[PDB]
């Protein structure tokens, strides 16, 4: 391959052992031709550090469903079926924030205004408050910031939708080798308080603000409750190398080492083959795992999926 050895994505010994081990899932390569610094630049959420108020779902008489897909409950909100890609940027913290916010806006604005909240804006105008930009960040501040400063609107890279659409291109990690391995290297883009030409309203007239920012309790049922009456939520869990290989079924960490922390958007649950799972939306494109979504073992706070559930309500009127 003209270059030196080492860091070749992951070894087949992995894929195959994860498979011979015969567990709740099955793995296969999602990334082809990539510098391993990329595979670790994806996992750019910190874990630890802050944590909003608290949200205690009063249990009582509400019987939640044995399964649930936040996309079905609200077909009117297309935002829910969207899978974003973050390019070579550790902005996963900002994506879960916006992808969860996007939905909630459509959810709580009656089913009125559905709007692609901009990760571009959160990513580049939040600063040291939220963390480190393209090199890691705190989902707590992510929401805190929406409530403080508010976020404009911005679709996908080169989508021409709204004020500030994400400026980072996706890496062709999907499936090719005519180009070289899109290394995770990258710099955090600049805070440009300005909408795309031709776009109206004005950037300042595009900021959508939130109501408050709270933490969801570390109990699965409370979470099932939050997603059920409010809308998808942003989480955090630890990434180990095997997870990179997810193709289908319910994930369970088997081997490999920590790639780092990765935020996501949980938007549902169900039980597949007697294994309760959480339906989570990644930010690695639609060619990753199962059409961009994936399932992780729920109820046993797997890899910390049930620890960091940050979230909040949008500002009506």
């Amino acid at each position: 391959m003209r270059s030196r050895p080492s860091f070749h994505p992951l070894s087949d010994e992995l894929v195959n052992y994860v498979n011979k081990r015969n567990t709740t899932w099955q793995a296969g390569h999602n990334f082809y031709n990539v510098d391993m610094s990329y595979l670790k630049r994806l996992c750019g959420t910190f874990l630890g550090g802050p944590k909003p108020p608290q949200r205690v779902m009063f249990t009582e008489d509400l019987k939640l469903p044995a399964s649930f897909d936040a996309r079905e409950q609200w077909p009117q909100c297309p935002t829910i079926k969207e899978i974003r890609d973050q390019g070579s940027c550790g902005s996963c913290w900002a994506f879960g924030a916006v992808e969860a916010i996007s939905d909630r806006i459509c959810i709580h604005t009656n089913a009125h205004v559905s709007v692609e909240v901009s990760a571009e804006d959160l990513l580049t105008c939040c600063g040291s408050m939220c963390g480190d930009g393209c090199n890691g960040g705190y989902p707590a501040e992510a929401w805190n910031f929406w409530t403080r400063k508010g976020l404009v609107s911005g679709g996908l890279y080169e989508s021409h939708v709204g004020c500030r659409p994400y400026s980072i291109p996706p890496c062709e990690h999907h499936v090719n080798g005519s180009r070289p391995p899109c290394t995770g290297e990258g710099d955090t883009p600049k805070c440009s308080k300005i909408c795309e030409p031709g776009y109206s309203p004005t950037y300042k007239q595009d900021k959508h603000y939130g109501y408050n920012s709270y933490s969801v309790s570390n109990s699965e049922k409370d979470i099932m409750a939050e997603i059920y009456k409010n809308g998808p939520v942003e989480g955090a869990f630890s990434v180990y190398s095997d997870f990179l290989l997810y193709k289908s079924g319910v994930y369970q960490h088997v081997t490999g080492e920590m790639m780092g922390g990765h935020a996501i958007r949980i938007l549902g649950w169900g039980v597949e083959n007697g294994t309760p799972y959480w339906l989570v939306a990644n930010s690695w494109n639609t060619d990753w795992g199962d059409n961009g979504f994936f399932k992780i073992l729920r109820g046993q706070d797997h890899c910390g999926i049930e620890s960091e559930v940050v979230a909040g309500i949008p500002r009506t009127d």
Side-chain angles (χ1 to χ4, degrees), residues 157-238:
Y157 168 83
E158 268 275 292
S159 66
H160 284 314
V161 201
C163 196
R164 298 172 66 173
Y166 203 57
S167 61
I168 302 177
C171 133
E172 297 285 330
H173 65 248
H174 335 303
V175 270
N176 71 96
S178 312
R179 306 190 210 245
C182 20
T183 90
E185 280 288 328
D187 177 61
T188 300
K190 55 161 262 86
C191 180
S192 307
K193 331 239 176 148
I194 166 165
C195 293
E196 216 181 45
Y199 182 58
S200 317
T202 70
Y203 164 109
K204 293 135 285 299
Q205 293 157 339
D206 211 48
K207 267 157 169 202
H208 298 265
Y209 317 73
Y211 230 115
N212 55 60
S213 185
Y214 50 81
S215 185
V216 172
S217 197
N218 201 90
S219 171
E220 70 135 322
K221 321 101 177 43
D222 292 279
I223 315 169
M224 298 180 38
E226 250 306 301
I227 310 180
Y228 187 55
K229 323 149 151 230
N230 297 307
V233 290
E234 191 184 8
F237 81 89
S238 299

Side-chain angles (χ1 to χ4, degrees), residues 13-34:
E13 187 187 8
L14 247 194
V15 145
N16 309 304
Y17 157 44
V18 179
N19 285 306
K20 288 145 155 290
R21 172 102 168 255
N22 202 359
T23 175
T24 51
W25 56 295
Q26 46 270 172
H29 299 107
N30 286 310
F31 308 100
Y32 302 69
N33 170 8
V34 271

